[PDB]
Amino acid sequence: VMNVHSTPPGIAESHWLGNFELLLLDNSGELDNHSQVLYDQIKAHFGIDSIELKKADSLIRINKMKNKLNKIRAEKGK
Amino acid sequence: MTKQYERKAKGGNLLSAFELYQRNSDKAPGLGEMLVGEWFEMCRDYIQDGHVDESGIFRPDNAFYLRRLTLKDFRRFSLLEIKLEEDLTVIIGNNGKGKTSILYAIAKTLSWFVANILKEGGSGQRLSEMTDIKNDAEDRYSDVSSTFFFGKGLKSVPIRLSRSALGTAERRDSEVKPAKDLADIWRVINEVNTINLPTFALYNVERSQPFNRNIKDNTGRREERFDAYSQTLGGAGRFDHFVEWYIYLHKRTVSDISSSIKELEQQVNDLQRTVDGGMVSVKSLLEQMKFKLSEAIERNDAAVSSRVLTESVQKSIVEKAICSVVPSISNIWVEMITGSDLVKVTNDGHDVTIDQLSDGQRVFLSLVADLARRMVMLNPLLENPLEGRGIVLIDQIELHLHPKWQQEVILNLRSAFPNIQFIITTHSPIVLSTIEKRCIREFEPNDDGDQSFLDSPDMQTKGSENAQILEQVMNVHSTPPGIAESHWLGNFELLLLDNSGELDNHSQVLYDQIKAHFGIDSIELKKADSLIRINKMKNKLNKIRAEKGK
Amino acid sequence: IRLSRSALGTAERRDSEVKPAKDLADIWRVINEVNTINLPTFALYNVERSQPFNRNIKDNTGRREERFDAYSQTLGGA
Numbered sequence: 001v002m003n004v005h006s007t008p009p010g011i012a013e014s015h016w017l018g019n020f021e022l023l024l025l026d027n028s029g030e031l032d033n034h035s036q037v038l039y040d041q042i043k044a045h046f047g048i049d050s051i052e053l054k055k056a057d058s059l060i061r062i063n064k065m066k067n068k069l070n071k072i073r074a075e076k077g078k
Numbered sequence: 079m080t081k082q083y084e085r086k087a088k089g090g091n092l093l094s095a096f097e098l099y100q101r102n103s104d105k106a107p108g109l110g111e112m113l114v115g116e117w118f119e120m121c122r123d124y125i126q127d128g129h130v131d132e133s134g135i136f137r138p139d140n141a142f143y144l145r146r147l148t149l150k151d152f153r154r155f156s157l158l159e160i161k162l163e164e165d166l167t168v169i170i171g172n173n174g175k176g177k178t179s180i181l182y183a184i185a186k187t188l189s190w191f192v193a194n195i196l197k198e199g200g201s202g203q204r205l206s207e208m209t210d211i212k213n214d215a216e217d218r219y220s221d222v223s224s225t226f227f228f229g230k231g232l233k234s235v236p237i238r239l240s241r242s243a244l245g246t247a248e249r250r251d252s253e254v255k256p257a258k259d260l261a262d263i264w265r266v267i268n269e270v271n272t273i274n275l276p277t278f279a280l281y282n283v284e285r286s287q288p289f290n291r292n293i294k295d296n297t298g299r300r301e302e303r304f305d306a307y308s309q310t311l312g313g314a315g316r317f318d319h320f321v322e323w324y325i326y327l328h329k330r331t332v333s334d335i336s337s338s339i340k341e342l343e344q345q346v347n348d349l350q351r352t353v354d355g356g357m358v359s360v361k362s363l364l365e366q367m368k369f370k371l372s373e374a375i376e377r378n379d380a381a382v383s384s385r386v387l388t389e390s391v392q393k394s395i396v397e398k399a400i401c402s403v404v405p406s407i408s409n410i411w412v413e414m415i416t417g418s419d420l421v422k423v424t425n426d427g428h429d430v431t432i433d434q435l436s437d438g439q440r441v442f443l444s445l446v447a448d449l450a451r452r453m454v455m456l457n458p459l460l461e462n463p464l465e466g467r468g469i470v471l472i473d474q475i476e477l478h479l480h481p482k483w484q485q486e487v488i489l490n491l492r493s494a495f496p497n498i499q500f501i502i503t504t505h506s507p508i509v510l511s512t513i514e515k516r517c518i519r520e521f522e523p524n525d526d527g528d529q530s531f532l533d534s535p536d537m538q539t540k541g542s543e544n545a546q547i548l549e550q551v552m553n554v555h556s557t558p559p560g561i562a563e564s565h566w567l568g569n570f571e572l573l574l575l576d577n578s579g580e581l582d583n584h585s586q587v588l589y590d591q592i593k594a595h596f597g598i599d600s601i602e603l604k605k606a607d608s609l610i611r612i613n614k615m616k617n618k619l620n621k622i623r624a625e626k627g628k
Numbered sequence: 629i630r631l632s633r634s635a636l637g638t639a640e641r642r643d644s645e646v647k648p649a650k651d652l653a654d655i656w657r658v659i660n661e662v663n664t665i666n667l668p669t670f671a672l673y674n675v676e677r678s679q680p681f682n683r684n685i686k687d688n689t690g691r692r693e694e695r696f697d698a699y700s701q702t703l704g705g706a
């Protein structure tokens with residue numbers, strides 16, 4: 001109705017969750033050095049009880065899961 | 079006497095150094111010029127020292143800001159204490175929980191600084207004896223305390239404004255001497271040699287006056303340097319004074335002194351040669367302009383000796399400050415219409431005038447313009463006068479502002495005025511989303527005034543969702559509890575929980591009315607569908623587990 | 629009802645068609661005179677409100693009990 005972003009766009013910390021996703025997808029759903037650095041930054045800024053870390057760890061767990069799936073599939077698909 | 083004073087002054091203390099300078103001001107001159115000059119030039123350098131950081135912003139070596147505020151029996155507070163952030167502090171809470179009282183007390187504290195900067199031995203405002211004293215208070219008096227910080231030399235500059243009620247049977251006195259000392263240093267150092275002075279401004283909710291297009295003619299008081307202290311801690315900033323000052327700057331830019339002193343000299347050269355033979359009657363009654371030539375020489379040396387900025391530079395600085403903070407204002411200038419001079423602005427490509435502005439753009443414009451004018455007048459020795467010291471109190475920063483403008487009201491203000499300590503109160507989570515958690519002091523919803531600390535939230539508000547800040551910090555539900563249709567999703571969840579998961583008659587009726595009200599593709603219907611699918615999957619898991627074994 | 633105004637310094641002026649409102653208010657007022665009737669309430673609350681309030685109004689000239697005082701400054705904004 002009001003045409004306003006729920007999360008402010010001018011704050012660099014607001015794009016961190018999306019910028020995370022990409023890092024985990026730019027790789028193959030898996031944590032690496034820079035993605036771990038970004039996750040540590042999200043931990044330090046938002047905190048443990050924050051929803052942002054909840055979604056970040058949900059993404060981490062899921063992408064670690066759709067890759068064990070992919071594994072059990074490409075192995076049998078050759 | 080001076081033996082330990084000299085050692086303490088060399089250690090980085092300007093109270094002892096100022097005492098030495100004052101004691102050596104009235105001593106024998108000539109031989110003692112260097113001795114007193116050392117103290118003067120290291121007290122002045124204490125105020126004027128600073129560098130330009132990697133961002134290109136001048137940072138004073140000794141920042142000035144308020145550190146601690148204590149309110150004893152002041153209004154609804156029994157004993158309240160605040161630790162204020164050096165750069166930005168935001169006070170949030172429900173209606174009638176303080177906030178305005180805190181800013182009011184800080185303003186009454188800063189009034190002593192302003193008054194003693196203006197006049198020798200000046201006196202500031204004092205707490206009211208009718209409404210500032212807490213009701214049902216057995217002490218029957220209130221006091222407010224401040225702990226300003228002005229660098230390593232002055233780590234704490236106490237002030238205590240006190241006030242006793244009617245027939246309190248004893249009178250409490252304000253200890254406001256450390257403010258007098260610091261402001262005496264500021265004033266006398268400025269008198270001997272021009273120095274940058276702090277700006278103390280308060281912006282109450284009483285800044286929404288509808289503007290007057292009739293401008294008092296420039297009598298000569300608005301371009302005086304110590305007019306930025308005129309009604310500065312009085313609620314609304316003087317926007318009429320800004321309009322007069324801006325029009326005066328425009329006139330002095332389009333006229334200048336390079337094309338006025340030469341014409342006066344030419345007139346004198348012609349008249350004197352004409353009256354060379356005699357008949358001085360044409361010079362007796364024309365001696366007024368020959369004396370006004372010297373009068374123009376006066377009031378001009380102060381413009382070059384004090385290192386004050388050029389009128390065009392001040393106008394450009396104020397224009398850049400105004401356009402870069404107000405989202406709608408693109409350009410501001412003075413135009414001559416029917417002879418009279420008026421200020422016109424650019425709102426989204428249109429060229430309306432000031433009194434055609436809305437209540438949201440005009441109030442923000444007046445705030446920013448007043449602050450910029452005060453900084454420009456009070457900081458003539460800086461390349462960017464907006465990077466100067468000061469304490470600015472703003473009540474309800476989001477006043478008359480759309481949520482779109484609230485996402486960028488803090489960044490713009492803190493980028494235009496980097497070195498000013500902003501102490502603001504807010505009622506919106508959109509403003510809080512752009513502010514760090516450490517900068518917020520919150521009143522708990524269940525607070526009767528006995529609490530003695532304002533604390534920061536336990537969630538990082540910066541960069542968070544509106545709903546999260548509204549729920550965890552402001553403690554208001556995402557859906558209005560007074561609306562019946564807002565509890566339909568929760569009822570649907572309960573109905574799906576108590577049943578086996580299949581849509582029975584009641585759940586089907588609830589789903590039908592939810593779809594009818596919110597819509598076919600609303601978020602509520604999508605949530606209902608996701609719950610339906612997840613309960614189907616849960617039942618499938620349970621069935622698989624049951625079929626695996628008993 | 630139409631309220632019209634021509635710009636300053638324009639030779640041709642535009643009139644306002646306010647007769648029907650006058651007729652309706654004449655009905656209200658004349659009927660009220662003969663037999664008291666309930667009258668409509670028209671109020672405007674602009675931004676001009678929220679000014680400080682001190683009890684400085686003693687000789688305020690006008691009589692607040694008088695029924696038609698409910699229309700005094702009722703559309704001023706405050």
Ligand SMILES: Nc1ncnc2c1ncn2[C@@H]1O[C@H](COP(=O)(O)OP(=O)(O)O)[C@@H](O)[C@H]1O
Nearest residue numbers: 153154173174175176177178179209211212213
């Ligand atoms: N002298 C007093 N004694 C007791 N309570 C007072 C006194 N003066 C004001 N209050 C209370 O303190 C509050 C002042 O409101 P205010 O400071 O403007 O809060 P907010 O800015 O959050 O709206 C009100 O709730 C008022 O009832």
